[PDB]
Amino acid sequence: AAWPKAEDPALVQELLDCVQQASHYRQLKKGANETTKSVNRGTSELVILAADTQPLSIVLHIPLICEEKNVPYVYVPSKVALGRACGVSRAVIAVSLTSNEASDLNSKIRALRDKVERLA
Amino acid sequence: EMETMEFLNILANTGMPGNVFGILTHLDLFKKPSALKDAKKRLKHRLW
Amino acid sequence: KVYRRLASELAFDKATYTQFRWNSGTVTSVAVCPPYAYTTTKDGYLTKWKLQDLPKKRPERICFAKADARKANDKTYQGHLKAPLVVKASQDGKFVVTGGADKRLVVYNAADLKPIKAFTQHRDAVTGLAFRRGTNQLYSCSKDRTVKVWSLDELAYVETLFGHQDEILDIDALGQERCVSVGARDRTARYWKVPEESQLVFRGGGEGMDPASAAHEGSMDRVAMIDDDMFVTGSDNGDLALWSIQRKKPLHVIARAHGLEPPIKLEDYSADEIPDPSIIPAPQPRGITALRTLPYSDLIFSGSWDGCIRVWRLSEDKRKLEAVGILGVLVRGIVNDIALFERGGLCVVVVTGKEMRFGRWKYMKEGRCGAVIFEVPK
Amino acid sequence: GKRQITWQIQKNKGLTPNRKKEQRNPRVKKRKKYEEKQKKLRSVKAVYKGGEGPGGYQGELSGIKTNLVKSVKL
Amino acid sequence: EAARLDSELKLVGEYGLRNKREVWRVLLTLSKIRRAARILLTLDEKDPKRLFEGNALIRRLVRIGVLDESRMKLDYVLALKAEDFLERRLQTLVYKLGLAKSIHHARVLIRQRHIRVGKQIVNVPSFMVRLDSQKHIDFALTSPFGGGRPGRVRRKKAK
RNA sequence: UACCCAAUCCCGACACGGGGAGGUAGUGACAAUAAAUACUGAUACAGGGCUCUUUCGGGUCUUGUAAUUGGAAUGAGUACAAUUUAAAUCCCUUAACGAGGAACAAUUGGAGG
Secondary structure (H helix, E strand, O other): OOOOEOOOOOOHHHHHHHHHHHHHOOOEEEOHHHHHHHHHOOOEEEEEEEOOOOOOOHHHHHHHHHHHHOOOEEEEOOHHHHHHHHOOOOOOOEEEEEOOOOOOHHHHHHHHHHHHHHHO | OHHHHHHHHHHHHHOOOOOOOOOOOOOOOOOOHHHHHHHHHHHHHHHO | OOOOOOOOOOOHHHOEEEEOOOOOOOEEEEEOOOOEEEEEEOOOEEEEEEOOOOOOOOOEEEEEEEOOHHHOOOOOOOOOOOOEEEEEEOOOOOEEEEEEOOOOEEEEEOOOOOEEEEEOOOOOOEEEEEEOOOOOEEEEEEOOOOEEEEEOOOOEEEEEEOOOOOOEEEEEOOOOOEEEEEEOOOOEEEEEEOOOOEEEEEEOOOOOOOHHHOOOOOOOOEEEEOOOOEEEEEEOOOEEEEEEOOOOOEEEEEOOOOOEOOOOOHHHHOOOOOOOOOOOOOOOEOOOOEEEOOOOOOOEEEEOOOOOEEEEEEOOOOOOEEEEEEOOOOOOOEEEEEEEEEOOOEEEEEEEEOOOOOOOOOOOOOOOOOEEEEEEOO | OOOOOOHHHHOOOOOOOOOOOOOOOHHHHHHHHHHHHHHHHHOOOOOOOOOOEOOEOOOOOOOOOOOOOOOOOO | OHHHHHHHHHHHHHOOOOOOHHHHHHHHHHHHHHHHHHHHHHOOOOOHHHHHHHHHHHHHHHHOOOOOOOOOOHHHHHOOOHHHHHHHOHHHHHHHHOOOOOHHHHHHHHHOOOEEEOOEEOOOOOOOOOOOOOOOEEEOOOOOOOOOOOOHHHHHHHO
16 A cells, blocks of 8 residues: 555665654644644755555555655555654654755755656 | 134134144043053044 | 672563552552552542562552642642652662642652742752662753752752653753753653753664664653763664663664554554455554663563563673563553662562553553563573 | 043044945845845745744635646756 | 845844944855865865865764755755854844844844853854754743742842 | 063073073064954834736735834953962953944945936
8 A cells, every 4th residue: 555665675774864853843733633734835955755654544544645746655564664753752643844945954855856756 | 522622723824834742631530451452543633 | 889790680571570569540650668668640639658578569558649639729738739750769778859830840858758949940840860879969851941959958959951842751860960861752862961051962873573663762762871972862763772872873773662553453443344455554663662671771661552572781892782682571551761770689560550650642441550570580 | 620532532433424234344234145045045936944833724814826837857 | 325225124123133243244254164075075086185175074064063964965055055054043033932032133132141051151143053952942041931039120020 | 672580491600690593572454363342122104016028018925114112242442459470461360431323433446216
């Protein structure tokens, strides 16, 4: 059901490290409804979705809006790891990290979405 | 003081002699020798 | 500080356990004052307890102290406002220190359990806490990526130490004036020379089953100094790595130290009238949640949420880690903490609950909010 | 009982012209010059300035002109 | 020229600089680094001079955080720029970490001694913060945003 | 036309006496280095602001005000001390004051009404 699944060799941890960097930079929206609202408002640059979700239909409904707006999306295999990487003290199943006109995080964003577009 | 500035411009308007020497006194009425050199510097530059 | 080797002089298959529990949310950490014990529970309790002797297997609680959040406004109240997270006890038996997420670390008398000092020097939260052995010098590493060393004899802060890239999760100390502290997602254990204010970085970058289930080193959760020259770190992809101070690399890393998780059920993963196993994600390794050692010994106690508490040992050249087996040969739940004590032959308490120490990421309906006390007599 | 020297003799101002509070500080002047040259830029080209708001699409809020071709003719 | 004036004004506005001397200072050190990179590209590949000196230059720039850790070639060292240097300045790092509301607020804070880099407070806003030291930018303990005394206008008002 | 043998060194009946080497301080826009002269809100009111190739024509959409108020931050300076030192100074520590323009008072040039 999750066909752009991320594989093991240092791509999941690059994703979660960029997630933690954006959460320190306050450029990140947490949870399914906030990812949905950020994609529909178009400010999203990339969206990470957990794949260990009890029933997967939530992180199945998000890729439709992401494919309609043409933003990259990728599944990491642990919502507990995604919540720990964000710094939430709750398990997060969907993470969308936005765009700003001036940062140094955007280089990591660009390399990450190049790797994700190669993954798709 | 105004008497010092008055004599300086009275002398300059009437006729400037060769040698005028500024003599700065009452330096012992000071407590901080950083304020002392600051006062010497600012009084020297204003006289110049 | 003499070196011991008691990895073979114990009978782990003959361990005697008391798996009890009491009215608590989730117990988090324990310290070992040599007759006593000190529990912290997320309800907001710190309970000082008395252990047992053989020549009745449950402790008798003697006293506790509760966090009072009503007097956050009210001044001259040393003590916590929120629930504490870590506790340590001085080997003198006269000081007990506890730090929580209420941005302050308090320290007081062990006997009457009445708060005497409430340090507010940290800026985010207190995550890790360690004593120098035989001395009242304290090392508290925090969530604002710093670690403050305190001189507790005069009840005073002496020095701070910066340099960690992410939030600092654990710290360990030994008899000298050093530290070893692990930070989470930077994958870094920093060895701390406190008098000259210097550090030594150790960057992990860790590397018939499914291939996508082999996860790299995500965080670096727990740390344990086993002697002066080497320590061990436990990382939430299940990596247990022995590190030497003489070398820049891991000395010996062992992978998936508590195995993989079970793959989640189709009856919860997909809401369909046909459950098909054609699609199900690869399970991830259950990482180390607690990790401890006895100082100057060959004992590596590692506990995850597998329901068992594993024990490892050093090699004869002390340049490798080796398995000696599962200790409880269950102790279900998420192993929050391990504490060790020698009778003269060792009693280890294991602190487990329904979730992890710092956040409610993984709640478990299985497991109990239990201190589980077991000893090996040989 | 001494005659203090006043500020006009203390610093020899003379007849320097009157300048601005913006001109007495070279950073604040270069802040206000950038705010007004970023303002002059919006009146020539079109800045992005956020997409659709949280309220949605309230129409093209300042006119639609039909006979205007604004494409670079290659 | 109008191109130089508009470029320097864009730098002075986008990063809250004081004059064009700071811009020319950064352009001078950037031209020195880029000249060293061009001189190392003059030599052929697998010359030991180019190998060790280019590895030294790239490791230096990655350690001071200007060059990204992804791209580590001498061609990207040639493709370096003054916007990257002024981004590595301290004042824009305070503005981007969000201790201050604007870049001029950040310059004001660094001047009147509120933030600290690591242990010691920093009085200069052009402090080139390295990548390892980027995280430890916070309010000092003697600042009223950090703690201690409630401060000056607070004391005059609370009296 | 500054101060001292206090350190390193030298000479003598000689542990003490004597040293124009040496070290300490002062000036300095000739250069060179870092950077203050402000930061941030709310309300009220006005309807225009800006631009150009092509000009009695075209382009773009939020900008102001000597308006009314509110917050904080404070180093120059003043400065108890202690310290530094041959004795002082500087440095590092440091209690107490220290911002509303009519001021704690930015300048030099050029163009124009």
